[PDB]
Design a protein around this ligand. Sequence first.
Ligand SMILES: Nc1ncnc2c1ncn2[C@@H]1O[C@H](COP(=O)(O)OP(=O)(O)O)[C@@H](O)[C@H]1O
Ligand SMILES: Nc1ncnc2c1ncn2[C@@H]1O[C@H](COP(=O)(O)OP(=O)(O)O)[C@@H](O)[C@H]1O
Lengths: 282, 283
Amino acid sequence: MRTQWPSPAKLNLFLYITGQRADGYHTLQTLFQFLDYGDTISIELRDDGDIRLLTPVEGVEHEDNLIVRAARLLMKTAADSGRLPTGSGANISIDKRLPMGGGLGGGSSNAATVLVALNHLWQCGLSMDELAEMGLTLGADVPVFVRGHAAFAEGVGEILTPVDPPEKWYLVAHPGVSIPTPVIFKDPELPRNTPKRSIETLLKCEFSNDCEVIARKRFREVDAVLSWLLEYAPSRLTGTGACVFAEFDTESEARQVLEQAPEWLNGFVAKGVNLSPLHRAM
Amino acid sequence: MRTQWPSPAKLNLFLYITGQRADGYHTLQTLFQFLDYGDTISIELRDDGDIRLLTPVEGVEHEDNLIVRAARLLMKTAADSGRLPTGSGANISIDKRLPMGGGLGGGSSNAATVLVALNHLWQCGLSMDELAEMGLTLGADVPVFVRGHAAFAEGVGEILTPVDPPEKWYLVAHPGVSIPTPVIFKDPELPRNTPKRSIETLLKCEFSNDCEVIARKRFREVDAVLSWLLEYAPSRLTGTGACVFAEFDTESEARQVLEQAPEWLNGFVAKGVNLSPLHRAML
Ligand SMILES: Nc1ncnc2c1ncn2[C@@H]1O[C@H](COP(=O)(O)OP(=O)(O)O)[C@@H](O)[C@H]1O
Ligand SMILES: Nc1ncnc2c1ncn2[C@@H]1O[C@H](COP(=O)(O)OP(=O)(O)O)[C@@H](O)[C@H]1O
């Protein structure tokens, strides 16, 4: 039989870069909230051990797809501890709505959703801790999606504390430019020394994204989108860009501004949700 | 009173790059063993809450030193979970023998030793898991040093399985070139698709380091050292370089080859040990 599984977007409501190790990896303090909007993943079980992604994702080959990578990692990890019933396989299809990149975390969401879904359908019986561990090897943000709650992330992205930030409505704009994450993280002007602070401190401070000053400066398209939206509401970069979000108390106000937006904002409106649509449909 | 604390070197006996995430981070499968050789960190407790590093490290600012970063992170973490006695502080001095970088893990080791030593001396009682967690925020290799045993490391460097590889003797050479880790990791020709395999598979395969082919080609001083050493013994890059190690069954044979070595090898000899000298001193 066929099952459907949400793969929501996220926003980083705040993102602080606390340090960079000698190998180049940046430590962060960041707050994740889900959008009630995203991809939908359909799965049909197989009993011949095969994994198939039936829907190509534009510009990614089958075996590099995070969906396939996640399913094969789960398969291999389970099998190595005798947790994988013989024949365990799946046909996987994605209704893909989230942009590629943008800082909405679509790739990580897809991998989280696949691990959680297949763990359940194959009855591998892995813990959420185990799924989150494994997921972190595939994408920086997979653990927040696997665990399913709005969360303050630190450590190397593995330390997650649930929080319940305001479930606002957002106008999420996608400036017409591609920003690969390394492009921002290699920038010499990137802040990399924001003081580590408590969740109690951060939650009461003004929210900002340390990547924003850089993305705005290097990419005119982000500067244009941000300038346009700040005339209406507090608006920030999510992830390492390019996407930018404007916060509103109600759907009507968000959509009021959307209807005034130029086409080049490539905007949509969605509500922040603290429990993931994945886990909710569970 | 003054206590002394080993901060040993490591070698990666093998290092496989299994993948790279969208954010640029590379996942690895690698085997660590310690050297019975390294830095020594001396600590004197303070009761006024200060942290001082009395010995500056070449080219590294006080507050950018991983010794200071690690001491301050523990203090904050203990204080906020109510596990730091009032006034806990320390004077810290390092007898620094390890090169800067080189793939011997000196910075990570210094940070691990500080965490372990100050956790013990201030009586905070943080677990090894907590100390390894904290440590991984400071350096990629801190967890192996905190947990104190030769180990197979995977995950994002947090998943450590004890292993007992052969305690060989090594001639460790330092080609005369600086290799920042990011330069190797950003290279387009670096392997990033080595199949993730089981520890049993790995332990019974030929050992290699996926970074070596890049380091050799970009920095021919590394190519020189490797070529010279490979005439005498199996030899490989450690970490992302520049250091290269050659393995030997005995100290005599290793020092015999050292004796013949040209000056530009900048070599020393040390024995691999599976229990960290830090943890051995604490027995
Ligand atoms: N199913 C997938 N969805 C999105 N990106 C994918 C997928 N599979 C592989 N990728 C690759 O990995 C990157 C992930 O980017 P993104 O969609 O923002 O996800 P995330 O930010 O969660 O990693 C993309 O650049 C893309 O080339
Ligand atoms: N006490 C320290 N010893 C060595 N390196 C340090 C120290 N403090 C900071 N560093 C930084 O770490 C890098 C060198 O790394 P290395 O000495 O091999 O240890 P590791 O690679 O394990 O951090 C340099 O960029 C240096 O500036």
